[PDB]
Amino acid sequence: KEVQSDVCIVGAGPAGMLLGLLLAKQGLEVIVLEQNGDFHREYRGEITQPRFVQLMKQLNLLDYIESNSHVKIPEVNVFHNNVKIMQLAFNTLIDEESYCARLTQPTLLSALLDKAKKYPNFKLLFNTKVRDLLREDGKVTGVYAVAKEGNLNIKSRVTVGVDGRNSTMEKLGNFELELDYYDNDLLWFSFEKPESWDYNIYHFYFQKNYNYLFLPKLGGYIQCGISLTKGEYQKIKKEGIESFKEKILEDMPILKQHFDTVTDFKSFVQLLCRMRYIKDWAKEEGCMLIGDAAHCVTPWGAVGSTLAMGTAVIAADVIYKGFKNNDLSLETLKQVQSRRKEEVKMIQNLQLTIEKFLTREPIKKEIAPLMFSIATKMPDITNLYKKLFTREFPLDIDESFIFH
Amino acid sequence: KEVQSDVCIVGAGPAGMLLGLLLAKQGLEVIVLEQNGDFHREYRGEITQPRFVQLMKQLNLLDYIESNSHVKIPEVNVFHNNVKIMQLAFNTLIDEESYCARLTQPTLLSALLDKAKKYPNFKLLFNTKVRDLLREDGKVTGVYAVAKEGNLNIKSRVTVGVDGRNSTMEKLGNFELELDYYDNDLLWFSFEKPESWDYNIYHFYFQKNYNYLFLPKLGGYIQCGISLTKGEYQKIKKEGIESFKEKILEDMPILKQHFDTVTDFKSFVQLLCRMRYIKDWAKEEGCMLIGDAAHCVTPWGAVGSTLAMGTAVIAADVIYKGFKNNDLSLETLKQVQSRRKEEVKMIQNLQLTIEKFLTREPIKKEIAPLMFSIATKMPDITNLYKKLFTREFPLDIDESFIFH
Amino acid sequence: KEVQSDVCIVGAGPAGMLLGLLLAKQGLEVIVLEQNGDFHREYRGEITQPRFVQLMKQLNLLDYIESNSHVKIPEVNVFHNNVKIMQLAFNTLIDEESYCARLTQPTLLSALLDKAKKYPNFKLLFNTKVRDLLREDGKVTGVYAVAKEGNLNIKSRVTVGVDGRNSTMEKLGNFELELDYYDNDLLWFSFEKPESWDYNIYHFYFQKNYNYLFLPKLGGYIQCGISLTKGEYQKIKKEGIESFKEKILEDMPILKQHFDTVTDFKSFVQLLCRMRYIKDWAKEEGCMLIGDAAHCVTPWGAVGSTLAMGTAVIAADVIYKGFKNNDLSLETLKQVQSRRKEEVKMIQNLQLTIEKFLTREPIKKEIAPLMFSIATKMPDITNLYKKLFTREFPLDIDESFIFH
Ligand SMILES: Cc1cc2nc3c(=O)[nH]c(=O)nc-3n(C[C@H](O)[C@H](O)[C@H](O)COP(=O)(O)OP(=O)(O)OC[C@H]3O[C@@H](n4cnc5c(N)ncnc54)[C@H](O)[C@@H]3O)c2cc1C
Ligand SMILES: Cc1cc2nc3c(=O)[nH]c(=O)nc-3n(C[C@H](O)[C@H](O)[C@H](O)COP(=O)(O)OP(=O)(O)OC[C@H]3O[C@@H](n4cnc5c(N)ncnc54)[C@H](O)[C@@H]3O)c2cc1C
Ligand SMILES: Cc1cc2nc3c(=O)[nH]c(=O)nc-3n(C[C@H](O)[C@H](O)[C@H](O)COP(=O)(O)OP(=O)(O)OC[C@H]3O[C@@H](n4cnc5c(N)ncnc54)[C@H](O)[C@@H]3O)c2cc1C
Ligand SMILES: CCCCCC/C=C\CCCCCCCC(=O)O[C@H](COC(=O)CCCCCCC/C=C/CCCCCCCC)COP(=O)(O)OC[C@H](O)CO
Ligand SMILES: CCCCCC/C=C\CCCCCCCC(=O)O[C@H](COC(=O)CCCCCCC/C=C\CCCCCCCC)COP(=O)(O)OC[C@H](O)CO
Ligand SMILES: CCCCCC/C=C\CCCCCCCC(=O)O[C@H](COC(=O)CCCCCCC/C=C\CCCCCCCC)COP(=O)(O)OC[C@H](O)CO
């Protein structure tokens, strides 16, 4: 059918969903579309940042978010050859409360949906794959989508895409990619937590054969990612499962119990560490790109979700200002990028610098952990930690967006 | 009065001058405006790069330029506490001709002008500072300038600004700065060459107090740049000339003879190591920013002039193609940036990495040279050399640009 | 025959000898057996630590030992390509007197023997090589040895093995060895001291071909050790003496006068840099392994003798406590290991980290020296110096062990 509204957010991710309710409490007609059936269809990570806590307290949602199931990671540890080389507790970064949080994306999305659906002007449609844009009169008037019931021409003055790195809307509008980075990947597998370890951990190991990352998998497990170069996993698959198991157990002898029942490669998940940046997030009238669709980043420090959420809150700010001033021009849509540009670019440069440490070249794989140990012992490093984990000042938002 | 041409180039530096004649030999009408009375008025540099040799040989200009006054520099040396830690002969980078050169901008510009003025369709005006842009019918039509003898209203299909880092057309057209970096400065002074030293040198020194750069100043002298942090030269002036002289002679005792007659700071010249990148070099029809006005860089590797010249060559190719096809809109003008983007950005990122070694912070200052040594002993380092000093492939340009 | 006492110490090296007299003044019955004829038979080193001085002045023995012949080494220097990269004066590590000391093991052992022989309950037998343990009634009750006159069945409640790395009692009791490290060796030779050098030196040199160590050999000479990889010595011997001499003199031209008279490999002495750690030093009643037989280490920093002496002091404390308490079970003998474990493991890990600098691999050999320079320029290097050279707190022992 034909339904008309004010804001159409393609994608029900953590960003759009946030952008879903921030406008919903402002009295705007909001429709949020997702192609999936729910938030459980795809696993998009669990670890968050102290920046997330900062934003939740800034929006006065910290207590409501904390009431759900979560785990507080107090610090991050880096080991070299099973010897600790760096330690950083998140509570020393800012005076207020700060901590990493194992908080599943489905649970946070469910909480946001529960809070948002109390507003009648909010409509969330699942199983709705957007097909194209109603680019009419030289501007984006709405979107043509298929609901699965029928075909919808859903019109809105603003159409915002948060479709993630695998965004179809990136090419529906002529959005030019000015940064496409893909150099490494991760091999994820979950194993039962050993009794010698803690559950609330955030660990990175430099070892002889591979580099490892250990995170608190939901349910009392430990979720470990092995860092590999792009195009190296199929070489390992050809080389044989036995060699991979031997090289892993030589590096991490405690994984022997889990690998005793491992005999093949299909228990691992290949995560592609992609990073992207759109040349201009808004270039037409009524269309703009925020979230992972525009500034997706690598999962080092768990900054991607918080970055998307901050960009979504800035976009809600700009959209509300445009509605109040009756000025939703494209130059108003440039404001979102002009405000998030410094944060996003600084974060992306930090991620590039961190990814430089993951080199697996003959001499560089051996000099990287020592380089990391030198870098973490500089007196400046603390500031860098803040640049990577906290927002120095809260995002300038109107007091109307604060929840009570 | 009323002067009508095809191309109007504001700026007669090495880039525009090249763009001045590359189109001039194509048969187009070219007018080049310069505020200075000659090329000798400002000192704009001496050192070139093997990229310059590659570009000259590609255009079949190498013999003509090499017939002038130049000094071939075969290698760059780096020292730590007066002990060499790095060496690189340029002839090993590529199989063709590869060498740095001492070549003053005035003589290169004089050679280019001598070649260009033989074409009747090329005109050059000196002491003609551009004031306004003749923006009419929603597009840039020409420039209003003052010649010192009258007020000229020059009309041309293409108006190209190569004004340099201190560009007046940078704001006449609303051009945005995507990057603006300024972290260090160079204190330049020339001293007579000691008999122990060679003339065709390119030397860098990590010393106790200051880092030094030595280049062959024209006339049998040696020009030295002392690297300082931004805003630190005033502190040095306050502290006194005697302390500065003592710390300089402690680092480099060979400078004693020159400093025997230095009693004040009015002989050193301060250079601001600014690096800039324009968001989009073409944003209006009939106007464009290329060269140092768009992608000015730091003087680490002598890449600035060659980069500007390559941008000018690509711009000449694009402009000639557009004139041939009778299509000089904004879309075709936006091709120069797309064709120079990756090279310019890679060079700027390498410059940022190199400038990271110039830190004067308490702890980082003493380990920075050693880091540099570790950098120069990597197996990959030679590729980096090829990325910094040479061009992998010649510029994709039409055959009529080759001189005979 | 039949000899019955309290303590039987197999081995009369610096550790056991110390524990030989510490218990002797407690009134216990002690026999110390040594297979050698005297303390001059085997060269066991000359360099001590400030830790040794701390231990000697803790027992009120510093003035007695210092009355002998010794050379005070005030500092340790590290050079790279004949240029000093590190300096450390030991007196800045603790407020008390702190220095290294060239003190020949025969001299210290003779002083300890002279102090101990005044006690009639102390008996030392040279040329009495132990052969077996009298393990009876499910526990060790003594030793069967041969004195060169007769066969001695020595009976003692406590039997302590300090036989060293070549321990013959290491396998008499099934002592599990949980760390067997051997990666490098040292080629030792003594040469006449040049007048340009100081005698009391502790010098390390990173050079082009080999790494060198210079110590004050007794008699006004200089003891030099060339660091080599395991098994490389016989490759050098096959390659020829002349090539070895040329590569040595290229690295250290000051050695030309000594190497003018060198024409064979029979002047150098090969020392194997082994480092062992027994899993548990006490596993049954009436037997124990301490000292070099338990925690042998590499000779970097001169830590082995002081570590063995400290272990012997702790073992004497535990043995006296058990004898006074009348409790000499396995669980009270485990106290020595439980108390020395942290110190010994910290020292051994530091030795591993130091030995990592002695790599001779193609590219790693060149970045190792200036990797050493970086680590010595860290803000926390002084804590590492204190941990590697000094003891933070004195060993907790009774006043009865203090000499008067
Ligand atoms: C496999 C994986 C693992 C990750 N792990 C972590 C981690 O451990 N820690 C961390 O901090 N971050 C992690 N991330 C990143 C994190 O998920 C993102 O930063 C976050 O999702 C940002 O929100 P978003 O809405 O922009 O992205 P997404 O939530 O991924 O946006 C995509 C959403 O839009 C919908 N959609 C897409 N296209 C369409 C369309 N055409 N029509 C309709 N709906 C559409 C999808 O159904 C989905 O709901 C991970 C991401 C992935 C892909
Ligand atoms: C002190 C100094 C030293 C340098 N040393 C080196 C070096 O050793 N090596 C190296 O590789 N690079 C060096 N450079 C950089 C190098 O000079 C530039 O990168 C290069 O000239 C770029 O070419 P261009 O024509 O775009 O710039 P420019 O040479 O600056 O060209 C701009 C010209 O246009 C004129 N102009 C500006 N505005 C107007 C206007 N409104 N109307 C009319 N004319 C106008 C200017 O007067 C100037 O003549 C140095 C620069 C400086 C300032
Ligand atoms: C060549 C060399 C150079 C060294 N240089 C230094 C140095 O510069 N600085 C430093 O701090 N350390 C040095 N050391 C190490 C130092 O000698 C030992 O760490 C130290 O002696 C430890 O004390 P210990 O008595 O347990 O060892 P040792 O003195 O080696 O113990 C062996 C003793 O036990 C006796 N013994 C062994 N087996 C039997 C048996 N079956 N029956 C009877 N007696 C037996 C031997 O006769 C000898 O007296 C060096 C060692 C060597 C081999
Ligand atoms: C080399 C033979 C010995 C020569 C010395 C002779 C006798 C005595 C002097 C002993 C000095 C030994 C210095 C050891 C330095 C060292 O590695 O210690 C470290 C130094 O601290 C650092 O982490 C600083 C940077 C460390 C750099 C890596 C050092 C270990 C690596 C060795 C390999 C070197 C060759 C290169 C191989 C790899 C190339 C591909 C201890 O660190 P920590 O975490 O315990 O504490 C921090 C510290 O206090 C600084 O803040
Ligand atoms: C490797 C993955 C990391 C695993 C844990 C991830 C999760 C949490 C931990 C987060 C902490 C990460 C911080 C690492 C330190 C770091 O990036 O430092 C850097 C230090 O400075 C830099 O810019 C370093 C440049 C990039 C270094 C690349 C690493 C080189 C390693 C191996 C390849 C060897 C080839 C080079 C050898 C030559 C040496 C120079 C941050 O720089 P900055 O300018 O942003 O800030 C500087 C700072 O404030 C003080 O200098
Ligand atoms: C220093 C001023 C310039 C002096 C030279 C003058 C003229 C010409 C010579 C130019 C030679 C420049 C080469 C410098 C090395 C360099 O850029 O390498 C780098 C090597 O890798 C890096 O990114 C190194 C990190 C950047 C430098 C960090 C700053 C180090 C100094 C001080 C801060 C110390 C704390 C931070 C430590 C970080 C761990 C390394 C470029 O990386 P890449 O991936 O592009 O290339 C890899 C390469 O093949 C391996 O090295």
Short mmCIF file of N, CA, C and O and ligand atoms in Angstrom, two decimals, chain A residues 356-357 364 370-372 374-375 378, chain B residues 76-78 86 88 202-204 206 211 213 300-301 350 353-359 364-365 367-369 371-372 374-385 387-389, ligand 6:
data_model
loop_
_atom_site.label_atom_id
_atom_site.label_comp_id
_atom_site.label_asym_id
_atom_site.label_seq_id
_atom_site.Cartn_x
_atom_site.Cartn_y
_atom_site.Cartn_z
N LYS A 356 48.07 -2.21 12.38
CA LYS A 356 49.47 -2.34 11.97
C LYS A 356 50.23 -3.33 12.85
O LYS A 356 51.21 -3.93 12.41
N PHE A 357 49.79 -3.51 14.10
CA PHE A 357 50.47 -4.43 15.01
C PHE A 357 50.20 -5.89 14.69
O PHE A 357 50.91 -6.76 15.19
N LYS A 364 58.43 -8.74 10.97
CA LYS A 364 57.48 -7.86 11.63
C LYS A 364 56.60 -8.60 12.64
O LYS A 364 56.24 -8.02 13.67
N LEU A 370 56.97 -6.50 20.85
CA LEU A 370 57.91 -5.59 21.49
C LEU A 370 57.60 -4.14 21.19
O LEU A 370 57.75 -3.28 22.07
N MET A 371 57.16 -3.84 19.97
CA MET A 371 56.75 -2.51 19.58
C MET A 371 55.56 -2.07 20.43
O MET A 371 55.48 -0.93 20.88
N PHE A 372 54.63 -3.01 20.63
CA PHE A 372 53.47 -2.75 21.47
C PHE A 372 53.88 -2.48 22.91
O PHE A 372 53.34 -1.57 23.56
N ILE A 374 56.75 -1.26 23.94
CA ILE A 374 57.35 0.07 23.98
C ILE A 374 56.27 1.14 23.93
O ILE A 374 56.31 2.12 24.69
N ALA A 375 55.29 0.99 23.04
CA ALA A 375 54.27 2.01 22.86
C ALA A 375 53.42 2.19 24.11
O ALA A 375 53.05 3.31 24.46
N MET A 378 54.88 4.54 27.03
CA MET A 378 55.04 5.98 26.88
C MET A 378 54.13 6.70 27.87
O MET A 378 53.05 6.22 28.18
N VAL B 76 70.89 9.58 -0.16
CA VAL B 76 70.49 10.25 1.06
C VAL B 76 71.06 9.47 2.24
O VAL B 76 70.93 8.24 2.30
N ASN B 77 71.72 10.17 3.16
CA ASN B 77 72.34 9.54 4.31
C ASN B 77 71.67 10.04 5.59
O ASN B 77 71.26 11.20 5.69
N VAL B 78 71.58 9.14 6.57
CA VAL B 78 71.03 9.46 7.88
C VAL B 78 72.04 9.04 8.94
O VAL B 78 72.63 7.96 8.86
N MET B 86 71.76 4.83 8.11
CA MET B 86 71.02 4.49 6.91
C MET B 86 71.72 5.04 5.68
O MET B 86 72.34 6.10 5.74
N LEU B 88 71.10 5.10 1.18
CA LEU B 88 70.24 4.72 0.05
C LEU B 88 70.72 5.46 -1.19
O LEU B 88 70.55 6.68 -1.28
N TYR B 202 72.73 14.91 0.80
CA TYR B 202 71.37 14.97 1.34
C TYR B 202 71.46 14.25 2.69
O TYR B 202 71.28 13.03 2.77
N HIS B 203 71.73 15.01 3.75
CA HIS B 203 72.08 14.43 5.03
C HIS B 203 71.03 14.76 6.08
O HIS B 203 70.52 15.88 6.13
N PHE B 204 70.70 13.78 6.91
CA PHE B 204 69.88 14.00 8.08
C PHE B 204 70.65 13.54 9.31
O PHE B 204 71.40 12.56 9.25
N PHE B 206 70.22 12.85 13.53
CA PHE B 206 69.64 12.79 14.86
C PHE B 206 70.75 13.08 15.86
O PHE B 206 71.70 12.30 15.98
N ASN B 211 67.59 17.93 15.64
CA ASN B 211 67.74 17.17 14.41
C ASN B 211 68.03 18.12 13.25
O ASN B 211 67.37 19.16 13.12
N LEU B 213 69.08 18.89 9.01
CA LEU B 213 69.00 18.47 7.62
C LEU B 213 69.94 19.34 6.80
O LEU B 213 69.90 20.56 6.90
N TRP B 300 60.00 16.42 3.21
CA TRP B 300 60.72 15.21 3.59
C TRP B 300 60.68 14.25 2.40
O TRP B 300 59.72 13.51 2.22
N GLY B 301 61.75 14.27 1.61
CA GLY B 301 61.84 13.49 0.39
C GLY B 301 61.80 14.32 -0.88
O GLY B 301 61.92 13.76 -1.97
N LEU B 350 52.74 8.91 3.92
CA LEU B 350 54.16 8.66 4.15
C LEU B 350 54.82 9.86 4.81
O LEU B 350 55.69 9.70 5.68
N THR B 353 53.96 9.76 8.47
CA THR B 353 54.77 8.76 9.15
C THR B 353 56.19 9.27 9.38
O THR B 353 56.75 9.11 10.47
N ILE B 354 56.79 9.90 8.37
CA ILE B 354 58.14 10.41 8.50
C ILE B 354 58.20 11.52 9.55
O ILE B 354 59.12 11.57 10.37
N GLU B 355 57.21 12.41 9.54
CA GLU B 355 57.18 13.50 10.52
C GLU B 355 56.98 12.98 11.93
O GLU B 355 57.35 13.66 12.90
N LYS B 356 56.39 11.79 12.08
CA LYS B 356 56.26 11.20 13.41
C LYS B 356 57.62 10.95 14.06
O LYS B 356 57.71 10.87 15.29
N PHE B 357 58.68 10.83 13.26
CA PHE B 357 60.02 10.61 13.79
C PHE B 357 60.68 11.89 14.29
O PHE B 357 61.76 11.82 14.88
N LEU B 358 60.06 13.05 14.07
CA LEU B 358 60.62 14.33 14.47
C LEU B 358 60.19 14.75 15.87
O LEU B 358 60.38 15.91 16.24
N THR B 359 59.61 13.84 16.65
CA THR B 359 59.10 14.19 17.96
C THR B 359 60.21 14.68 18.87
O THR B 359 61.34 14.17 18.84
N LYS B 364 60.18 10.10 24.01
CA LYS B 364 60.18 9.70 22.61
C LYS B 364 61.34 10.31 21.83
O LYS B 364 61.74 9.75 20.80
N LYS B 365 61.88 11.43 22.29
CA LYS B 365 62.95 12.09 21.56
C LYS B 365 64.22 11.24 21.52
O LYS B 365 64.96 11.28 20.53
N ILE B 367 64.43 7.76 21.87
CA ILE B 367 64.27 6.47 21.21
C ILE B 367 63.88 6.60 19.75
O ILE B 367 63.92 5.60 19.02
N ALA B 368 63.52 7.80 19.29
CA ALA B 368 63.10 7.99 17.90
C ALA B 368 64.17 7.60 16.89
O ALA B 368 63.83 6.91 15.91
N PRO B 369 65.44 7.99 17.03
CA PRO B 369 66.44 7.54 16.05
C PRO B 369 66.54 6.03 15.96
O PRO B 369 66.59 5.47 14.85
N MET B 371 64.27 3.73 16.63
CA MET B 371 63.10 3.31 15.87
C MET B 371 63.39 3.43 14.39
O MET B 371 63.18 2.48 13.63
N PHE B 372 63.91 4.60 13.99
CA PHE B 372 64.24 4.82 12.59
C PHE B 372 65.17 3.74 12.07
O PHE B 372 64.95 3.18 10.99
N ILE B 374 65.49 0.67 13.20
CA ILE B 374 64.70 -0.55 13.04
C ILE B 374 63.86 -0.47 11.78
O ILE B 374 63.68 -1.47 11.07
N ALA B 375 63.36 0.73 11.46
CA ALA B 375 62.57 0.88 10.25
C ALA B 375 63.41 0.63 9.00
O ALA B 375 62.92 0.04 8.03
N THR B 376 64.67 1.04 9.02
CA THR B 376 65.48 0.96 7.81
C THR B 376 66.09 -0.41 7.59
O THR B 376 66.66 -0.65 6.52
N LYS B 377 65.98 -1.31 8.56
CA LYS B 377 66.53 -2.66 8.44
C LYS B 377 65.47 -3.70 8.11
O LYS B 377 65.81 -4.89 8.02
N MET B 378 64.22 -3.30 7.94
CA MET B 378 63.17 -4.24 7.55
C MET B 378 63.35 -4.68 6.10
O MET B 378 63.87 -3.93 5.28
N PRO B 379 62.96 -5.92 5.79
CA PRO B 379 63.05 -6.38 4.40
C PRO B 379 62.18 -5.59 3.44
O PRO B 379 62.53 -5.45 2.26
N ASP B 380 61.06 -5.05 3.92
CA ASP B 380 60.09 -4.36 3.08
C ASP B 380 60.53 -2.94 2.74
O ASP B 380 60.04 -2.38 1.75
N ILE B 381 61.51 -2.39 3.47
CA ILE B 381 61.78 -0.95 3.44
C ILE B 381 62.04 -0.45 2.02
O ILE B 381 61.65 0.67 1.67
N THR B 382 62.67 -1.27 1.18
CA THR B 382 63.02 -0.81 -0.16
C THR B 382 61.77 -0.44 -0.96
O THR B 382 61.76 0.56 -1.68
N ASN B 383 60.70 -1.22 -0.82
CA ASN B 383 59.44 -0.88 -1.46
C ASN B 383 58.98 0.51 -1.04
O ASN B 383 58.57 1.33 -1.87
N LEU B 384 59.08 0.80 0.26
CA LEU B 384 58.75 2.14 0.75
C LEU B 384 59.57 3.20 0.03
O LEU B 384 59.04 4.24 -0.37
N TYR B 385 60.87 2.93 -0.16
CA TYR B 385 61.70 3.85 -0.93
C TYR B 385 61.09 4.09 -2.30
O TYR B 385 60.93 5.24 -2.74
N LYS B 387 58.10 3.84 -3.14
CA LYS B 387 56.86 4.60 -3.02
C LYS B 387 57.13 6.08 -2.75
O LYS B 387 56.29 6.92 -3.06
N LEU B 388 58.29 6.40 -2.17
CA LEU B 388 58.55 7.77 -1.75
C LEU B 388 59.35 8.57 -2.77
O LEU B 388 59.16 9.78 -2.87
N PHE B 389 60.22 7.92 -3.54
CA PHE B 389 61.14 8.64 -4.41
C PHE B 389 60.92 8.42 -5.90
O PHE B 389 61.39 9.23 -6.70
C1 LIG D 6 62.83 11.33 10.53
C2 LIG D 6 62.73 12.43 9.49
C3 LIG D 6 63.12 11.97 8.10
C4 LIG D 6 64.59 11.62 7.95
C5 LIG D 6 64.90 11.05 6.58
C6 LIG D 6 65.17 12.13 5.53
C7 LIG D 6 64.93 11.74 4.11
C8 LIG D 6 64.74 10.55 3.52
C9 LIG D 6 64.68 9.16 4.07
C10 LIG D 6 63.24 8.70 4.27
C11 LIG D 6 63.11 7.31 4.87
C12 LIG D 6 61.81 7.15 5.65
C13 LIG D 6 61.58 5.74 6.16
C14 LIG D 6 61.17 5.70 7.62
C15 LIG D 6 60.54 4.37 7.99
C16 LIG D 6 59.07 4.31 7.70
O1 LIG D 6 58.41 5.25 7.36
O2 LIG D 6 58.58 3.08 7.88
C17 LIG D 6 57.28 2.92 8.46
C18 LIG D 6 57.31 1.62 9.24
O3 LIG D 6 56.07 1.32 9.87
C19 LIG D 6 55.45 2.23 10.61
O4 LIG D 6 54.34 2.64 10.37
C20 LIG D 6 56.29 2.67 11.78
C21 LIG D 6 55.52 3.50 12.79
C22 LIG D 6 55.67 5.00 12.56
C23 LIG D 6 56.74 5.62 13.44
C24 LIG D 6 56.34 5.72 14.90
C25 LIG D 6 57.14 6.76 15.67
C26 LIG D 6 58.44 6.22 16.25
C27 LIG D 6 59.19 7.28 16.99
C28 LIG D 6 58.90 7.80 18.18
C29 LIG D 6 57.76 7.46 19.08
C30 LIG D 6 58.02 6.20 19.89
C31 LIG D 6 56.76 5.61 20.50
C32 LIG D 6 55.91 4.83 19.49
C33 LIG D 6 56.47 3.45 19.18
C34 LIG D 6 55.65 2.71 18.14
C35 LIG D 6 56.21 1.35 17.77
C36 LIG D 6 57.06 1.38 16.51
C37 LIG D 6 56.18 3.03 7.43
O5 LIG D 6 55.28 1.95 7.56
P1 LIG D 6 54.68 1.22 6.22
O6 LIG D 6 53.74 0.11 6.60
O7 LIG D 6 54.22 2.26 5.24
O8 LIG D 6 56.12 0.62 5.73
C38 LIG D 6 56.63 -0.53 6.37
C39 LIG D 6 58.13 -0.59 6.16
O9 LIG D 6 58.46 -1.26 4.97
C40 LIG D 6 58.84 -1.18 7.37
O10 LIG D 6 59.60 -0.17 8.00
#
